[PDB]
């Protein structure tokens, strides 16, 4: 979300200021992929407003470009349209006719799955693709619902369906209310699927979590069920606390995307030590030679810790640390 | 029992690759490494994680080169980083290190052919530091490539670094003898093209800087346009650097070409 730090008279300043040293950041780092040419005043994010409207200039969106991308990268990395983008852009809450193509692709895709297990791994990584698109909360009821059929029927030693299936099922039931018929075989599904050797499904069981603790005030008892994640995060930021080099790079920076997220937007469903060790071994990590950690992963923690040093959660002593 | 059903998930993944789908076949060949990892085998483990490495850059190979896909979002780039690494780690507990320099470079080159050369410089300095003790002109060419892809992503710093690191470890093992001698031609130049884009103060100028800047403030035709260069941005004369770019077009490779055009850029 935009910050509550902003928009004061003291904000405004340290706005400017960050916004001349994010530029030329954004001159020495980042990736021209939206760029063709060679100016030095040329950093532009395609976020839009929000019946779409103007496009939103890069001074005013400062620290609204998420954790999980490389600086001005240009890419699908599956975190394109939020489900605040989805609850709010369609009146949903808990000029080419896109909507026919696809109903007309749920209709096929659901005849498919209800053929090689070829065909039914691309049509599922093809549904969580289209997913975007759609703008009716009954098309993503039939999605949960095919991909539940499918879950049921096709067997579980398929670890490729699973890397394709799993963030697909969690972005349909968080468009839906997760209610607990659906929150129970979701979060069993995410907390077997973490356990996998699988590294992306690990990514897009992760990936999953992000969508699931997005947006929906959740279910006391499936809240409970989060702690899972956090010694996840607890061991897999131990583990790759001294050597970035040797282990992997999207599955490091996403995990720490989401784990600043919990730190932010869920405090209290995990103790204050869980938040100070994440402090401490991005400090780690930081403190790297310039060859251990590479430069995507250390400005995108860099960028998420003063994210959360711009929000009023964090308390006063890790702040000093940082 | 296990090298049987070892041979039959080896039949599967030749059936599949005659089948030309692989993201299977290479679920295959991770099956084929489970089983030699079942008993104790060790580089045959390594030949089928590699190959499974093999199927998934393929598989990534056409999606992002053949097709340039908008949908492509690197799922099979992770499973081979994860393959490697394996393979990687494989090679380093046998004992070997020359292979899991290979399967660095590999995966380097890979992700320098689908536009990400930050990883690429990355793997490559990797598979250079392993084979410093063992193969010194390979690593020469591995930190080569490393500063190519340093030069791609915009990191001239770390090009500086590379290419000393370059020069000095030619110094060490030319006394020049060969292709030592064009490494050494290919730093004398690109780092002179780099300190005249960036300039650094005399705090950060280390010394071998001061040694090849009082050097020049390789053949006699451009070591003299490198001097009158030099002398030329040292002086910000812009009308020679014009005719020196026209005349130094067909002398360089088209990297040091792109240094000497932001060289030419930055001083006007």
């Given at each position: ?5 902003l ?16 530029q030329?950041?954004?001159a ?31 001074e ?6 998420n ?25 949903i ?20 799955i209800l053929t090689?297990?070829?065909?039914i791994s ?5 549904l ?22 499918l879950?049921?029927?096709h ?8 890397q ?17 018929a ?6 069993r ?15 897009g ?37 001294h050597?970035?080099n ?5 599955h490091?920076?996403?995990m720490?995307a989401?784990?600043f997220?919990l ?10 030590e ?7 071994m ?16 250390y ?23 940082l | 029992?296990?090298?049987e059903?070892?041979?039959?998930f ?11 789908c692989l993201?299977?076949a290479?679920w ?21 994680l590699?190959?499974?490495?093999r ?15 908008p ?13 490697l690494g ?5 090679h380093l507990?046998?004992?070997?290190p ?5 399967l660095?470079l ?40 490393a ?17 000393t ?15 030592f ?5 290919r730093?004398?130049?690109?780092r002179?093209?780099?300190?005249l884009?960036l300039?650094?103060?005399p ?21 003299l346009?490198?001097?009158?260069l ?23 490779t ?13 001083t006007?």
């Amino acid at each position: 979300k935009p910050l509550k730090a902003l928009d004061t008279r003291f904000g405004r300043k340290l706005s400017i200021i960050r916004g001349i040293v994010e530029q030329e950041i954004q001159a020495m780092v980042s990736k021209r992929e939206n760029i063709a040419t060679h100016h030095l005043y040329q950093a532009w994010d395609p976020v839009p407003s929000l019946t779409t409207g103007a496009l939103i200039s890069h001074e005013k969106l400062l620290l609204q470009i998420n954790p999980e991308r490389e600086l001005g990268s240009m890419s699908y990395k599956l975190g394109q349209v939020s489900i605040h983008s989805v609850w709010l852009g369609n009146s949903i809450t808990p000029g080419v006719d896109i909507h026919s193509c696809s109903q007309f692709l749920l209709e096929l895709y659901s005849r498919w799955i209800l053929t090689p297990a070829i065909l039914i791994s691309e049509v599922v990584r093809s549904l969580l693709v289209v997913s975007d698109l759609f703008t009716e909360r009954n098309q993503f009821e039939l999605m949960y619902v095919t991909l539940t059929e499918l879950r049921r029927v096709h067997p579980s030693e398929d670890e490729i369906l699973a890397q394709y299936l799993v963030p697909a099922t969690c972005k349909a039931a968080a468009v839906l209310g997760m209610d607990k018929a659906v929150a129970e075989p979701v979060s069993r599904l995410l907390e077997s699927t973490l356990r996998s050797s699988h590294l992306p499904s690990r990514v897009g069981a992760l990936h999953g979590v992000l969508y699931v603790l997005e947006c929906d005030l959740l279910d006391d008892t499936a809240k409970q069920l989060i702690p899972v994640i956090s010694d996840y995060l607890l061991s897999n930021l131990k583990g790759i606390a001294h050597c970035v080099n040797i282990h992997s790079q999207q599955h490091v920076l996403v995990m720490c995307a989401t784990a600043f997220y919990l730190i932010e937007n869920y405090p209290l469903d995990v103790g204050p030590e869980f938040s100070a060790s994440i402090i401490q071994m991005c400090g780690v990590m930081l403190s790297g030679s310039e060859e251990s950690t590479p430069s995507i992963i250390y400005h995108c923690a860099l960028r998420g810790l003063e994210r959360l040093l711009l929000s009023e959660q964090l308390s006063r002593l890790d702040a000093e640390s940082l | 029992n296990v090298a049987e059903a070892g041979e039959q998930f080896g039949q599967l993944g030749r059936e599949l690759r005659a089948q030309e789908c692989l993201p299977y076949a290479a679920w295959c060949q991770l099956a084929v490494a489970r089983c030699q990892q079942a008993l104790f085998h060790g580089p045959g483990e390594a030949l089928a994680l590699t190959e499974a490495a093999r199927l998934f850059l393929r598989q990534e190979r056409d999606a992002r080169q053949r097709l340039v896909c908008p949908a492509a979002y690197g799922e099979p780039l992770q499973a081979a980083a994860s393959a490697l690494g394996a393979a990687v780690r494989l090679h380093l507990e046998l004992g070997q290190p020359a292979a899991a320099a290979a399967l660095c470079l590999e995966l380097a080159a890979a992700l320098r052919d689908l536009g990400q050369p930050a990883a690429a410089a990355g793997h490559f300095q990797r598979a250079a530091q392993l084979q410093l003790p063992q193969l010194p002109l390979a690593a020469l060419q591995a930190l080569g490539e490393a500063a190519s892809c340093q030069l791609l992503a915009r990191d001239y710093t770390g090009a500086l670094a590379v290419f000393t690191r370059m020069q000095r470890l030619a110094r060490e093992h030319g006394s020049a003898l060969g292709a030592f001698s064009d490494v050494l031609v290919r730093c004398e130049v690109s780092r002179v093209l780099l300190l005249l884009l960036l300039q650094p103060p005399p705090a950060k100028l280390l010394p071998e800087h001061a040694q090849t800047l009082e050097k020049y403030s390789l053949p006699e035709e451009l070591f003299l346009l490198l001097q009158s260069l030099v002398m030329a941005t040292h002086e910000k004369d812009t009308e020679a650097i014009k005719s020196l770019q026209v005349e130094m077009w067909p002398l360089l490779t088209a990297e040091q070409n792109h240094l000497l055009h932001l060289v030419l850029q930055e001083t006007i």
